[PDB]
Design a protein around this ligand. Structure first.
Ligand SMILES: O=C(Cc1cc([C@@H]2CCNC[C@H]2COc2ccc3c(c2)OCO3)ccc1F)NCCc1cn[nH]c1
Ligand SMILES: [Mg+2]
Lengths: 62, 339, 630
């Protein structure tokens, strides 16, 4: 189909004409994000039993 | 001819995209993160087992309170669970047996689900009276409902076997925007933290980034060798991960417009069903058809740990918004909550 | 006594009947129990249909009215009546044209019993469509399903009959007076012995008797011993028939001696209507003789034993079949085809024996079988001068050797015989209604009144009788209707009301099958592992991707997925058919159903649902099995 193939061209032109950053900078940003949030991540930084809703505890709210 | 030429200019545009991506590939995530310590051995126990589905579980979704969750099963029900006590807050028998997906609205007022009925059904969890009712049956897809996620109580995004996604106005029951572009069944979707963008993963082995408000495909990501079954945004919105039938997960960056990392091991040969990040984005957790959940260092690519608590496929998973736990759901009819 | 299955039986039965095209207005309305439940539905629960059905029943009563004076009176009452007016009051009245035909025959004083037939037809065209579909939706169709489940699960044995004195004896067996225990209805049981049948090579005879009884037993003929049931036990064949405890006419001829013209005329008229019934169904009887005429306690008679009868709708018989002194020429000649012709000749021989004491071709007590035949083929019979002229005209009519000249073969059948001078005194409708006084009222308890003048069972022997059991639907439904239907329905109504209140105090609506995509539901019995489990009765719900089951007092907590099912097969466990489901991982799941239609339907539905589910799952990337080893 010629309508389809022209649609593909228009689409690819939208995809091509975007601003891209360097991988080295994109990667540094992900790393910095993980580092700023490492201490608030309980799967990473295991919490004391007393702060952990799923250990040593029967009395809950709602 | 015209068709000869439009194909050739498409191919040439694909080369220019490829060339401009390579021009950005000045280093790797793996090189950039060489100096940070490994996360060590990630080890968790099963803190709850959620029993009550009578057959395979296909999906799950946490409420925003990090406490309730909704699961969907081959038994033709949704169950809404209180993960803290393990009690069933609601058990919802569906109109169609063939449910495949489910979603918890951020407010906690609705769930949604659907499957081979090709419908996204919306359930009002607290009526005027205090009953659980179907409040809307979103009809319009031409093939199965694969995933659905609420933006708010009046808007939801769906993906489908008909190769499209859509944005729905729940009140009118109508598709407000249709996202067309995939050439295979769309299997999964994930909303950006700000809900202006979403990404989809499909059986054409690509992921696409969509503008919610304006209706277009902004970027297309390739590299998987086979179906993408699952997708999830990295928590700052600038990257996302996919899981595929090719036995790999991958990390894609939006602004660099390319793949940053592959997460795989020569001993893992089956498909990934499900992906989610830990609260900080440092861990990528994925479910596998070999009955495990593997936990990856998202920055460094090493396998950090394994959750091995199911007797059949891990079909779904999710990390709570408070980061405190991970839920796994399985073909063995159980969910487990781990930390 | 009859215990109806519960209303949820409908889930299986509705489907089983729809699959056979049996849930139409015509199929249900023409069954006696179907009609009774539809009537109940219309009179009591659907205002728009009630007058149609009341009118319909008035006409049904009108049809059965014996005198022309009664029908002049009643036709006028019906026309001048309130139901007639109710029907113009509604916006579905009778047509100008039907009304004109009726009121035209009325004003000219002529009142046939089918006077109101165009009204019947218009009523039925209006019962067709929405009113019928509303019946199907109602509890009265549910109740039809309950009765129908019982009808289609009948397996009679000796223990279902309280069996009493011998009322007939033959070479193959005996007949008994008996009472069917569940309804109290009285019948004859003709009990033929298989050892004795093997010994005398009459298997095709026993079997032909059954097919012939089937062809003949609908329509409630008052002049043939018809069948309600056939069944068999390891040593016996058993036919359940119209009770005739007055002995046969071979015995009564020998006790009373010969019969007057008037006496024989009673017997002949009754016999002629029996033959008419048979010939209208393209059956030739062939063995008409006095030992095959039986009497009831009142002296009314019926033709019995269709062993030697034949169906001529497709292929006219050639063979020499009968008893030697009553067989027609065109029969005795092997390779001359014949139809009902044969019975009219045989009738002639028989009406002669009742008058004279011997067949007209057995002269001096003689038995030369070849000579009896030569007399039938050669000499016309001299009729003694003492016979009336009307009787002479009749026997000369019936005994013509040439079929082309013979009374009853000139192309109008029995009607030719009925018009004979000999019967001028008779009203044939009165014959039909058994209104004429019989000549001989048998003494009560008369012993030996129906005697004829006189090794192992292989599995190949049993194999010949495979398709012997049979229930005549119309006969069972009439039995039930006239005995226990009303009382069972009331009791059953009360039982269901009671389970309903109790269910609601408990907080239990039996609603688990509703609002979902459940295909079918009902009771079955289950077994798993043969060492670990035993038969447990549970309530099953079939959904497109799984089969769930529950005990009493909880919702389902167990199931098999359609995915796990590899095959569904019939199999025998202790003389009882079960379903064997082979499950992935070499396990087994076995099912026993409570009735024959349930086993047929659960088999078909399970098979359909597992095959469709598996072909569907294979197309869905998220649900299908994926490779786990290279
Ligand atoms: O024994 C029978 C059938 C039979 C006949 C009779 C009677 C023999 C004498 N003529 C009347 C017959 C029928 O007797 C009946 C007596 C009472 C009845 C009844 C039939 O139906 C309803 O109530 C009694 C038991 C029977 F089993 N037929 C043998 C045919 C044969 C073949 N080779 N040799 C002989
Ligand atoms: Mg012949």
């Amino acid at each position: 189909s010629i309508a389809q193939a022209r649609k593909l061209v228009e689409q690819l032109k939208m995809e091509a004409n975007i601003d891209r950053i360097k991988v080295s900078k994109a990667a540094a940003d992900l790393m910095a994000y993980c580092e700023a949030h490492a201490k608030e991540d309980p799967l990473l930084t295991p919490v004391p039993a007393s702060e952990n809703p799923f250990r040593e505890k029967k009395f809950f709210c709602a | 001819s015209e068709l000869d030429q439009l194909r050739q200019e498409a191919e040439q545009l694909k080369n220019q995209i490829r060339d401009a991506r390579k021009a950005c590939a000045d280093a790797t995530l793996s090189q950039i993160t060489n100096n940070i310590d490994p996360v060590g051995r990630i080890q968790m126990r099963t803190r709850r087992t959620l029993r009550g589905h009578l057959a395979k579980i296909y999906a799950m979704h946490w409420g925003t309170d990090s406490r309730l969750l909704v699961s969907a099963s081959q038994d033709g029900k949704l169950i809404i669970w209180d993960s803290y006590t393990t009690n069933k807050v609601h058990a919802i028998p569906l109109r169609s047996s063939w449910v495949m997906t489910c979603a918890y609205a951020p407010s906690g007022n609705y769930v949604a689900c659907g499957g081979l009925d090709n419908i996204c059904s919306i359930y009002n969890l607290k009526t005027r009276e205090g009953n659980v009712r179907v409040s809307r049956e979103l009809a319009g897809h031409t093939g199965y409902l694969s995933c659905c996620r609420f933006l708010d109580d009046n808007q939801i995004v769906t993906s489908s076997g008909d190769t499209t996604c859509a944005l729905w106005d729940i009140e009118t029951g109508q598709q407000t925007t249709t996202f067309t572009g995939h050439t295979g069944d769309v299997m999964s979707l994930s909303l950006a933290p700000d809900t202006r963008l979403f990404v989809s993963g499909a059986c054409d082995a690509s992921a696409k980034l969509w503008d919610v408000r304006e209706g277009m495909c902004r970027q297309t990501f390739t590299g998987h060798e086979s179906d993408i079954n699952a997708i999830c945004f990295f928590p700052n919105g600038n990257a996302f991960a996919t899981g595929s039938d090719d036995a790999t997960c991958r990390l894609f960056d939006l602004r660099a417009d390319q793949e940053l990392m592959t997460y795989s091991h020569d001993n893992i040969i089956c498909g990934i069903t499900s992906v989610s990040f830990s609260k900080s984005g440092r861990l990528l957790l994925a479910g596998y058809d070999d009955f495990n959940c593997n936990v990856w260092d998202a920055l460094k690519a090493d396998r950090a740990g394994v959750l091995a608590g199911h007797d059949n496929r891990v079909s779904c998973l999710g990390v709570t918004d408070d980061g405190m736990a991970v839920a796994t759901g399985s073909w063995d009819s159980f969910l487990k909550i781990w930390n | 006594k009859i215990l109806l299955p519960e209303p949820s039986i409908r889930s299986v039965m509705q489907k089983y009947l729809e699959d056979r095209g049996e849930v139409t207005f015509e199929k249900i309305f023409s069954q006696k129990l179907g009609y009774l439940l539809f009537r109940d539905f219309c009179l009591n629960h659907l205002e728009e249909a009630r007058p149609l059905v009341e009118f319909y029943e008035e006409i049904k009563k009108y049809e059965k009215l014996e005198t022309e004076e009664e029908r002049v009176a009643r036709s006028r009452e019906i026309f001048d009546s309130y139901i007639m007016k109710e029907l113009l009051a509604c916006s579905h009245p009778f047509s100008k044209s039907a009304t004109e035909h009726v009121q035209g025959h009325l004003g000219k004083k002529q009142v046939p019993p089918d006077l109101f037939q165009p009204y019947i037809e218009e009523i039925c065209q209006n019962l067709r469509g929405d009113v019928f579909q509303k019946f199907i939706e109602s509890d009265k169709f549910t109740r039809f399903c309950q009765w129908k489940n019982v009808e289609l699960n009948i397996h009679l044995t000796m223990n279902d009959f309280s069996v009493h004195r011998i009322i007939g004896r033959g070479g193959f067996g005996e007949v008994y007076g008996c009472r069917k225990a569940d309804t109290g209805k009285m019948y004859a049981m003709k009990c033929l012995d298989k050892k004795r049948i093997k010994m005398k090579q009459g298997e095709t005879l026993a079997l032909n008797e059954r097919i012939m009884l089937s062809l003949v037993s609908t329509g409630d003929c008052p002049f043939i011993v018809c069948m309600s049931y056939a069944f068999h036990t390891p040593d016996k064949l058993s036919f359940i028939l119209d009770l005739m405890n007055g002995g046969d006419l071979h015995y009564h001829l020998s006790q009373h001696g010969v019969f007057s013209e008037a006496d024989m005329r009673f017997y002949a008229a009754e016999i002629i209507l029996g033959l008419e019934h048979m010939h209208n169904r393209f059956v030739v009887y062939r063995d008409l003789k006095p030992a095959n005429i039986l009497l009831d306690e009142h002296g009314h008679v019926r033709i019995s034993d269709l062993g030697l009868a034949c169906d001529f709708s497709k292929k006219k018989p050639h063979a020499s079949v009968g008893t030697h002194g009553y067989m027609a020429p065109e029969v005795l000649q092997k390779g001359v085809a014949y139809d009902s012709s044969a019975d009219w000749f045989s009738l002639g021989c028989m009406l002669f024996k009742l008058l004279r004491g011997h067949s007209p071709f057995r002269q001096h007590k003689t038995k030369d079988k070849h000579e009896i035949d030569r007399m039938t083929l050669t000499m016309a019979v001299e009729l003694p001068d003492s016979f009336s002229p009307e009787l002479r005209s009749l026997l000369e009519g019936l005994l013509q050797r040439d079929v082309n000249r013979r009374l009853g073969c000139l192309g109008r059948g029995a009607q030719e015989v009925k018009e004979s001078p000999f019967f001028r005194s008779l009203d044939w409708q009165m014959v039909f209604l058994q209104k004429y006084p019989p000549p001989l009222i048998p003494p009560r308890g008369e012993v030996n009144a129906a005697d004829a003048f006189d090794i192992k069972l292989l599995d190949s022997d049993q194999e010949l009788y495979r398709n012997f059991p049979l229930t005549i639907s119309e006969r069972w439904q009439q039995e039930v209707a006239e005995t226990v239907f009303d009382t069972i329905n009331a009791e059953t109504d009360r039982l269901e009301a009671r389970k309903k209140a109790k269910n609601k105090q408990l907080g239990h609506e039996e609603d688990y099958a509703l609002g979902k995509d459940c295909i079918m539901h009902g009771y079955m019995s289950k077994m798993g592992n043969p060492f670990l489990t035993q038969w447990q009765r549970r309530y099953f719900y079939l959904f497109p991707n799984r089969l769930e089951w529950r005990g009493e007092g909880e919702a389902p907590q167990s199931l098999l997925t359609m995915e796990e099912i590899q095959s569904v097969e019939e199999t025998q466990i202790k003389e009882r058919k079960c379903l064997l489901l082979k499950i992935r991982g070499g396990k087994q799941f076995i099912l026993q159903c409570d009735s024959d239609p349930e086993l047929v339907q659960w088999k078909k539905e399970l098979r359909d649902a597992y095959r469709e589910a598996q072909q569907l799952v294979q197309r869905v990337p998220k649900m299908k099995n994926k490779p786990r080893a290279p």
